[PDB]
Structure formats: structure tokens, C-alpha cells
Coordinates of C-alpha atoms in Angstrom, one line a residue:
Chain B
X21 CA 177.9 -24.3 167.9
X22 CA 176.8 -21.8 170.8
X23 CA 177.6 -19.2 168.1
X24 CA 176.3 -20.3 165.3
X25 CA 173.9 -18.2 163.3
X26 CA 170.3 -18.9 162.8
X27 CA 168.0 -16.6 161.1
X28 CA 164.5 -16.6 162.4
X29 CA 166.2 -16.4 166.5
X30 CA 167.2 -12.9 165.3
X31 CA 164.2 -12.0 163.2
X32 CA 162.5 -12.9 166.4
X33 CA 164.2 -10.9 168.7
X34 CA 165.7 -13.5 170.4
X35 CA 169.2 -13.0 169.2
X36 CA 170.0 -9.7 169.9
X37 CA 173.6 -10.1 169.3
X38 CA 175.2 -7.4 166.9
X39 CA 178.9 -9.0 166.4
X40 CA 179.3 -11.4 164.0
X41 CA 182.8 -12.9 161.9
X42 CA 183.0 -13.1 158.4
X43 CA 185.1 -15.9 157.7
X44 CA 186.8 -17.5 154.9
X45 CA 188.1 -14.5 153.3
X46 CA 190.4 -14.9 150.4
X47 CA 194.5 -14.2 152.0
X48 CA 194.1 -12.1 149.0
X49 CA 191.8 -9.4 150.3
X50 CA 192.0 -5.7 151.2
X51 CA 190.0 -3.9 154.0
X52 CA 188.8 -1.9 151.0
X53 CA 187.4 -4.9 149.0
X54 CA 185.9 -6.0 152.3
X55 CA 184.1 -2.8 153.2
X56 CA 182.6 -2.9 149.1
X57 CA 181.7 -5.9 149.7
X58 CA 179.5 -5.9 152.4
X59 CA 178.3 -2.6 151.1
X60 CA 176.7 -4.1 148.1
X61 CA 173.8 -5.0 150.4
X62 CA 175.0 -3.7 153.5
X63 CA 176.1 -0.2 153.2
X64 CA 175.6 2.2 156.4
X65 CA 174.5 -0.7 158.8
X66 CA 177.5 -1.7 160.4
X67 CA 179.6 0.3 163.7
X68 CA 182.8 -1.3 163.3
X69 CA 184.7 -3.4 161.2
X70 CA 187.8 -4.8 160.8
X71 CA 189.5 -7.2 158.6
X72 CA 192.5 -8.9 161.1
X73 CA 196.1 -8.1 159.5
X74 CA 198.9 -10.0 160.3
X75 CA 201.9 -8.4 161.7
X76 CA 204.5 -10.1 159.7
X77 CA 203.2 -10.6 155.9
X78 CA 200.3 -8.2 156.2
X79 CA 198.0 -10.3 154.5
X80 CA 194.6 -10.7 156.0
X81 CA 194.3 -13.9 158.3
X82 CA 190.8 -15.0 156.8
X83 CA 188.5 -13.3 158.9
X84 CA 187.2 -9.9 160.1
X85 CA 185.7 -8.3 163.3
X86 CA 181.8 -6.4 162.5
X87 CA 179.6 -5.0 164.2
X88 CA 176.1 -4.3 162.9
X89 CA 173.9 -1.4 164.3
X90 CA 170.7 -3.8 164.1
X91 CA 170.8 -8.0 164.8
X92 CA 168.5 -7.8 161.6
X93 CA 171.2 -6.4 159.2
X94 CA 172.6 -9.8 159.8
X95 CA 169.9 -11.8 158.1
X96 CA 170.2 -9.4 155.1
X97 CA 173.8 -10.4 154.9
X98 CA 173.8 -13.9 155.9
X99 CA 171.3 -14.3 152.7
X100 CA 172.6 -12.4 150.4
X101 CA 176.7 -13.5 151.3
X102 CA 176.3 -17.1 153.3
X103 CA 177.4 -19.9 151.0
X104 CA 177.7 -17.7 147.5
X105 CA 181.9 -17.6 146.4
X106 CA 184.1 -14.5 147.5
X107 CA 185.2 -14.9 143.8
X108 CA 183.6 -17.5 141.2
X109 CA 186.8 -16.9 139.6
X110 CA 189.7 -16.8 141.6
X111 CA 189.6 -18.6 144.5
X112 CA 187.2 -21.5 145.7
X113 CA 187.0 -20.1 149.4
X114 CA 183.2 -19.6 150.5
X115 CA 181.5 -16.8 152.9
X116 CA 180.8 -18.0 155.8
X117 CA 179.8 -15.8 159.0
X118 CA 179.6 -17.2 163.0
X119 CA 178.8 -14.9 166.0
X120 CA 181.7 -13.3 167.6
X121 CA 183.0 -14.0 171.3
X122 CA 183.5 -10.3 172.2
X123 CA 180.2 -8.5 171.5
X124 CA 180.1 -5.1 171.1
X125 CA 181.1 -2.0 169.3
X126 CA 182.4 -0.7 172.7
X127 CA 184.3 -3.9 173.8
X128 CA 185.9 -3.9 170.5
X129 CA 186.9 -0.9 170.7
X130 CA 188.5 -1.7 173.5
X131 CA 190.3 -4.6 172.1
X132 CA 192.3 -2.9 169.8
X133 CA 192.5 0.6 171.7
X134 CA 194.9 -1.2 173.9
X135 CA 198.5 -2.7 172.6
X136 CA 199.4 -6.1 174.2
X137 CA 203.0 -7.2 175.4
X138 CA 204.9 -8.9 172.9
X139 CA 207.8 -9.9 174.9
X140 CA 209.7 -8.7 178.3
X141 CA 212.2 -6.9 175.9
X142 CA 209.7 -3.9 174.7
X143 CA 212.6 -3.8 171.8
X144 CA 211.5 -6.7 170.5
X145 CA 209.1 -7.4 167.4
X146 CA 207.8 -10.3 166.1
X147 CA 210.4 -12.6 164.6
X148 CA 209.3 -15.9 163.2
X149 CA 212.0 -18.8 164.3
X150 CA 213.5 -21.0 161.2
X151 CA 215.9 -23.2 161.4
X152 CA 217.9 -25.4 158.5
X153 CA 220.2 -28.4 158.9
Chain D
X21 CA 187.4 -32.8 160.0
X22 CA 189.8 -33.7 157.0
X23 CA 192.9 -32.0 158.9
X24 CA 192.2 -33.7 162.7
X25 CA 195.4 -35.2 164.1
X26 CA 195.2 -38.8 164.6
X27 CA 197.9 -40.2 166.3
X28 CA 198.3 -43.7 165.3
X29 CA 197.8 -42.5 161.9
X30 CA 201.5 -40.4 162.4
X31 CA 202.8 -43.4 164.4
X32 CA 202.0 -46.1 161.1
X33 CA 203.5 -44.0 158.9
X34 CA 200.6 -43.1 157.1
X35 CA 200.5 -39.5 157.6
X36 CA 203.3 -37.8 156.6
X37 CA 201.8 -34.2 157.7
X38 CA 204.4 -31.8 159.9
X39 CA 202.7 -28.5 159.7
X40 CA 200.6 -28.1 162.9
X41 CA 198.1 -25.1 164.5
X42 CA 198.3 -24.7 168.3
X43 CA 194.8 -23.4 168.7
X44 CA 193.0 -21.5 172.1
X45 CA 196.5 -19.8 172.4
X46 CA 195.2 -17.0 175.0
X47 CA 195.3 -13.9 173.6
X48 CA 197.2 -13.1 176.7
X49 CA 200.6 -15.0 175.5
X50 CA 203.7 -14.4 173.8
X51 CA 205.8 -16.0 171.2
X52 CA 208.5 -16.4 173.7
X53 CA 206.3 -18.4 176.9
X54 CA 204.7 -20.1 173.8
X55 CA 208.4 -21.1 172.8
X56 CA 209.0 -22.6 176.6
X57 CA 206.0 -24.5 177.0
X58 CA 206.8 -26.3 173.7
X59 CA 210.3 -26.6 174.6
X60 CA 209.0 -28.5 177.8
X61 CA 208.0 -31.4 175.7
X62 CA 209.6 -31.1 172.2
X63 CA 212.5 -28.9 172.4
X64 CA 214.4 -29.2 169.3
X65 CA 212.1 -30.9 167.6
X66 CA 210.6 -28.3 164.9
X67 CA 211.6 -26.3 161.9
X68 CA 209.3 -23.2 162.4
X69 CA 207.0 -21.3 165.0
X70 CA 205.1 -18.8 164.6
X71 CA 202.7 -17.0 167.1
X72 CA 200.3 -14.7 164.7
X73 CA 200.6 -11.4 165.5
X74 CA 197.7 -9.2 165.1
X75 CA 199.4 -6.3 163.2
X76 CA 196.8 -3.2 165.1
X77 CA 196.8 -4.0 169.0
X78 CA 199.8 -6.8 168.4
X79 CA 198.1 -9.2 170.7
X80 CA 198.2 -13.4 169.2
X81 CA 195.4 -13.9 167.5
X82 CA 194.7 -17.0 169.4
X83 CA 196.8 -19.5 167.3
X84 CA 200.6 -20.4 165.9
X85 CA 201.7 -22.7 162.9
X86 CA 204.9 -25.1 164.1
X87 CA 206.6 -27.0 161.5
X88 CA 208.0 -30.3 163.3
X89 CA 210.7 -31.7 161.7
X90 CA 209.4 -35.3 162.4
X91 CA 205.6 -36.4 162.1
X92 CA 206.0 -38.3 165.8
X93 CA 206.7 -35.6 167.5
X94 CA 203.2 -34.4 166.6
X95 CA 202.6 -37.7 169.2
X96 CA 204.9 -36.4 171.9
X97 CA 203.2 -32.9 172.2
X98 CA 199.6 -33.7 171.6
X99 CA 199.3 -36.4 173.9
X100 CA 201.6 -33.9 177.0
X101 CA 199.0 -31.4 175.9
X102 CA 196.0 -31.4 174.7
X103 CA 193.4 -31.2 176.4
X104 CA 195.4 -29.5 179.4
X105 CA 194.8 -26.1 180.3
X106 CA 197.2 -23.0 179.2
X107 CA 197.0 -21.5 182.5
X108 CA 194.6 -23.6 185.1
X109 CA 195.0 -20.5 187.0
X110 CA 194.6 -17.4 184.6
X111 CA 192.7 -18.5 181.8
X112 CA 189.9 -21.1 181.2
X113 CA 191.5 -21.5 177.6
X114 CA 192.4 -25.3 176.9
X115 CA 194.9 -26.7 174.0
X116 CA 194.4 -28.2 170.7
X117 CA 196.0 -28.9 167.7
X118 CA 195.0 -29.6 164.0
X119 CA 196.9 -30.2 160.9
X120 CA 197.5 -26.8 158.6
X121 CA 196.6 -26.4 155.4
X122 CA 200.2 -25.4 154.2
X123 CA 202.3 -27.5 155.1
X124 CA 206.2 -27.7 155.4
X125 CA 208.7 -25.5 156.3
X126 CA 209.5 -24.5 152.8
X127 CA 206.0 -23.1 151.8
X128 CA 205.7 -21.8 155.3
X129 CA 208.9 -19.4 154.7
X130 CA 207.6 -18.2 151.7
X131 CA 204.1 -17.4 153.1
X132 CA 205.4 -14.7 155.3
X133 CA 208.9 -14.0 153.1
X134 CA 206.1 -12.0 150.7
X135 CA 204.1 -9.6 151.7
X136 CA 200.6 -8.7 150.4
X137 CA 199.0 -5.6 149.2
X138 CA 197.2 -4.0 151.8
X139 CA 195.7 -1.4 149.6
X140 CA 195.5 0.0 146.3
X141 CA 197.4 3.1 147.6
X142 CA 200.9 1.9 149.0
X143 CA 201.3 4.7 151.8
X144 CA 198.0 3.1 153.3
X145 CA 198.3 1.3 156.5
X146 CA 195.5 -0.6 158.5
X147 CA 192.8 1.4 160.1
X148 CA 189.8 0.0 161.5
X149 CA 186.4 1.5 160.6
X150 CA 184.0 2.7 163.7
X151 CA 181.2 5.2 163.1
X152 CA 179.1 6.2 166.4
X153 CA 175.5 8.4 166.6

């Protein structure tokens, strides 16, 4: 909506926004596969990226944080990645990307510099509640 | 879109659907306040909550899946609170909720019983990627 993507605003320098989500990713990715996949046609443009983890399972949550040096490198992305299949083969999830809320190598940085509170008892981790009966 | 919650669509029976995303979650909250502000409305009335927990700055990601044991109760705590604010004081953030796509408690459990490959090489653990000059 507000952060949807469209090409030509960048191209034109309107859009000078640099962080961007690449959604839809397979649960059955790894950072690794990630970073070789953008680097296909995207290698050495990007400042930051991260593919979110989940505490519990540790599989990736569908999405993943990057920043781009350059608002153009998004077009060459976009194109190349924006509607094509993560895997013909093995899944039927498709690439999708939207701007991201935080902007910013150095905001995101920040973001994930800086733990959060996960309960008043610092003891605690992250335990899903199930119940039966 | 084809996972909106319509309520008189639970309350005639026709959809069976009781796996449920609490969406706009601040990233400022924790499993346990999320916990008591559903226990305000529907205590004891679910199977399963969980509050995704980003695994590298352990801050929610901004959502939770909840299991409810009965499709009505999906009545009971929309209608108390969506649309309402989290916080009308400390955060702008406003409720919503939407159908998963997994649903039920049993495919739930195993979703985060197994966990994923993170990397080819097992000793690996997350680590963003940031580059600066």
C-alpha cells in the first residue's frame, strides 16, 4: 500500500528508499540459499541482510530484512525475482518483495544490536503453551 | 482475502477454522502480557499460543498463532478487540486477526516439535550479514 514497490518512482529518484522485504520464502530456506540467491543478480549491492529465524523451531519465518546500497539495485531484483517461483519444483510459494517499515542499514542495525525483554523472569525462554483434554 | 475472519460465517457453523494470527502485536510485548490480554476475554478458551520469537534480538516479530478450542470464541475475541488499540498510550499499533494457514493444534505441535536445518554446517548458528565502506 504506502509500501508497495513501483519501479519507475525509484528509477526516477523519487523513491530513495534502500530497505526492502523479500517475502514468501520457502520455511525451508537457509540464510545461505538466501544470500546465493540474490547474488545471482545481486551480488555485492546489498548492506545488510537477514533472513528472520525463529526462536523456537529455527526455521525461517517467510521473510527477510535487506538493505540495498543503491534504490536502483531494487529494480534489478524486483525484475529479475518478482513473480518467478523460489523453486519450480518444490514448493509453489512465489517472490514477492514490499518496502520495509524501518529503513536503514543503521536503524537495523540497531534493531537487532539490542536484545528485547522476554519476560519479568530474565530466566525465562520462550515456551509455547499446549494444553490436551 | 481467502483466510479473513468472518464472524457469522463461525457463528452458522460454516467455518470450522480454529487456528488464528494476532497481528500488529508491538514488537514491544511479551508472551506473557499477550497471555493476559487474551485471558481478559477468552481465558481458557484455546489449545495453543504462541508469540514468535525472533531467534537474534528475541523481540515478537509482530504476530502469535492461538489455537481456540471452539470456532466461536474466534467471535468473543475479535469483536472485544479488533480494531482497539494494544496500548492507546504507548503504541499507535492496533489489533487484528486472520485465519492461519496451518491449522489445529495437532499440526501446530509438530510445526515447532521439528526443527529445521539452519545450515549445511550443523555448528552454524544465525548471523546477520552487514558490510560498511
Amino acid at each position: 500500500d504506502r509500501n508497495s514497490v513501483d519501479y519507475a518512482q525509484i528509477a526516477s529518484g523519487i523513491d530513495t528508499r534502500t530497505t526492502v522485504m523479500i517475502k514468501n520464502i520457502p520455511n525451508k530456506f537457509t540464510q545461505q540459499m538466501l544470500r546465493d540467491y540474490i547474488d545471482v543478480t545481486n551480488k555485492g549491492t546489498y548492506d545488510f541482510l537477514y533472513l528472520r529465524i525463529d526462536f523456537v523451531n529455527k526455521c525461517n519465518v517467510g521473510y527477510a530484512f535487506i538493505n540495498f546500497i543503491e534504490p536502483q539495485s531494487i529494480i534489478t531484483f524486483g525484475k529479475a525475482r518478482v513473480g518467478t517461483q523460489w523453486n519450480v519444483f518444490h514448493s509453489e510459494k512465489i517472490c514477492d518483495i514490499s518496502y520495509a517499515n524501518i529503513q536503514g542499514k543503521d536503524r537495523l542495525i540497531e534493531k537487532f544490536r539490542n536484545s528485547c525483554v522476554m519476560d519479568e523472569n530474565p530466566a525465562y525462554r520462550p515456551k509455547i503453551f499446549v494444553s490436551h483434554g
